Amino acid sequence: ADQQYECVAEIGEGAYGKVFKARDLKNGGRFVALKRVRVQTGEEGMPLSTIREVAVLRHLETFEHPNVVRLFDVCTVSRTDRETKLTLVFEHVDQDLTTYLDKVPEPGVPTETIKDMMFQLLRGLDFLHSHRVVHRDLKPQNILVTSSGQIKLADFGLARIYSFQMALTSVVVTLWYRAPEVLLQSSYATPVDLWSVGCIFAEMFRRKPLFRGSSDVDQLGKILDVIGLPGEEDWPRDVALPRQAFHSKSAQPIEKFVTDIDELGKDLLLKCLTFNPAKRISAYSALSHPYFQ
Amino acid sequence: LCEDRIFYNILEIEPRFLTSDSVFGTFQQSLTSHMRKLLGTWMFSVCQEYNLEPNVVALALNLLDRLLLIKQVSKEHFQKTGSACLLVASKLRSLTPISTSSLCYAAADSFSRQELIDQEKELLEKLAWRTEAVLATDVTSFLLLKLVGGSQHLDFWHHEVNTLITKALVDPLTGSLPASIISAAGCALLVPANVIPQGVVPQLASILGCDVSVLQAAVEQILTSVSDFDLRI
Amino acid sequence: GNELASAAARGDLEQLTSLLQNNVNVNAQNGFGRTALQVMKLGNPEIARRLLLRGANPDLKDRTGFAVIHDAARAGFLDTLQTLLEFQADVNIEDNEGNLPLHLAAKEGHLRVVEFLVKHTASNVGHRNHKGDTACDLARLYGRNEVVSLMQANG
């Protein structure tokens, strides 16, 4: 394209190149999101990953899942040999979970809306897993919410920095959704995403993040303070930070923080927020949980 | 119920990768079905030889034939084109992606490393980076499992069926069929009744949700196609 | 300038707010010829409110002939559309094809946005765009029947 899509603003830049907001000139100038990468030619040609990643996106698009953001197009602009400007065009939703949650009136989000969003979230998440794709960076700013109230999973590759008041330290917000296996630099498998679903789930009630760690060792602790120290059987073998590294942790009643959640909600929430990745619920299972009736 | 649900969905996508033998004497003009059968077997050689998984050939052939559906390819460059498909296909499927130099070589050095690279860029542009496809080799496992119930043997037959599948694909006629069909048809032709519970075709047909006659037709067709395969230059 | 626009675009209220304390020009266009209010994160009514509160002019249309209220109305962000009116934005401003926010909301099926326009704004309903169509016509021409009904149950 690049004459059909007209940029209007740069949103930022991160792991997937620069992100812009543009008008789709062949659909009434409706807003669309673009990702632009400068792909490096090798003596081997086009870089494997570049090819693989675009391949997978294009392919998952075939299925048109309602809970994943649409990929409208792929434009190419070859500069010289060594450079090719690659551009992915996606559907754009001018609102994410964060902008929504911290905008709702005081009572909070309707419990019935929390359920509906949560169901859709696991719907699109189950779709990705079932096609052997792991998101690995499920943060609320990657969760799109249409005015209609529809959930669409994104992945902009854009980090957000949060600065701690008194501490004079900062962190990249994603840390707050990172699963323990990941923090302990142990396994990085699919359950990884369920732990985040659990964090996001809890956040819908709180409208404030559940575990706001300042480092990865700090995060780990913030977690064990609530869920309690796992047993010998549930801690990862041969890992840099042993179970012994964290003193006795009781296990406070989750509702103490995910205020106003219900009995079945609490059940699902803890099945996501389960330390041992192998005993953590699956997107498909969660989906079949009596919370959704 | 993980398996069963992915299968069901893959089936809807499926038709999206269908190709057609009808292209040659018309839209192609310069190329003929037989020239394609030659290029195709050469590709087959390079692969199973340079140690590539069957998937790589299955996909490389799908890209080549999907490409021939929108781009008129000359006789002088048919080969180089088949090579670009091979490169891209292994970059997407082998732990051991075959090298440019390696290809240019087996290609009698008929084309330059740059030129092959320029065809890769070209191939990607005409197909708009849509390089993955549901393959008949991608389905054989799930089916082979519903037949050979247990787990034992599941690997001998899988690799066997998929090798047949690739041979049937060297013939452009095969490309007009759904991945599921080509896949079941292949199973049906090799797997002996002694390694299966309890017919094979009515059993697969039941899974694919198609008619027994439809699957049989596919068997029959693919049987013919596979027979013609012959690596003699 | 450009950083204000980008802050509005990524919806960084924090950052946007600094920039707005430096007595900068809220109406300046970025390198794409667009202003911060125009490219702003529509789901965030507060981004809009602050810009408006600092002089942003709601009725400016871009090279492509659109005003924020058009895009908000098209996305169904009623609160934002409402805070826009709250600051005197013109409800009947037409795009370059003679559309009103109403047309676009109707064309998109945003019933609670059509609801509002029809019953609480000076939205000139009968207005026909350059193709002679109406908001309700477009709803009809697009299947937004649910919208068509309500719309005509009123006008």
Swiss-Prot record, chain A:
Keywords: Acetylation, ATP-binding, Cell cycle, Cell division, Cell projection, Cytoplasm, Cytoskeleton, Differentiation, Disease variant, Kinase, Nucleotide-binding, Nucleus, Phosphoprotein, Primary microcephaly, Serine/threonine-protein kinase, Transferase. Its main location: cytoplasm. InterPro entries: CDK, CDK6, Kinase-like_dom_sf, Prot_kinase_dom, Protein_kinase_ATP_BS, Ser/Thr_kinase_AS. Residues 5-292 form the Protein kinase domain. The modification N6-acetyllysine is found at K256. Changing P191L: In a metastatic melanoma sample; somatic mutation. One of its GO terms (biological process) is regulation of G2/M transition of mitotic cell cycle. Interaction with D-type G1 cyclins. Cyclin binding promotes enzyme activation by phosphorylation at Thr-169. Binds to RUNX1, CDKN2D, FBXO7 and CDKN2C/p18-INK4c. Forms a cytoplasmic complex with Hsp90/HSP90AB1 and CDC37. FBXO7-binding promotes D-type cyclin binding. Interacts with Kaposi's sarcoma herpesvirus (KSHV) V-cyclin and herpesvirus saimiri (V-cyclin/ECLF2); the CDK6/V-cyclin complex phosphorylates NPM1 and thus lead to viral reactivation by reducing viral LANA levels. This is Cyclin-dependent kinase 6. It comes from Homo sapiens.
From Swiss-Prot, chain C:
Keywords: ANK repeat, Cell cycle, Repeat. Gene3D superfamilies: Ankyrin repeat-containing domain. GO terms for molecular function: cyclin-dependent protein serine/threonine kinase inhibitor activity; protein kinase binding. One of its GO terms (biological process) is regulation of G1/S transition of mitotic cell cycle. Changing A67P: In breast cancer; loss of CDK6 interaction. The keyword Cytoplasm does not apply. PROSITE patterns: ANK_REP_REGION, ANK_REPEAT. ANK repeats lie at residues 1-28, 32-60, 64-93, 97-127. Highest levels found in skeletal muscle. Also found in pancreas and heart. GO terms for cellular component: cytoplasm; cytosol; nucleus. Belongs to the CDKN2 cyclin-dependent kinase inhibitor family. Heterodimer of p18 with CDK6. Interacts strongly with CDK6, weakly with CDK4. Inhibits cell growth and proliferation with a correlated dependence on endogenous retinoblastoma protein RB. This is Cyclin-dependent kinase 4 inhibitor C. It comes from Homo sapiens.
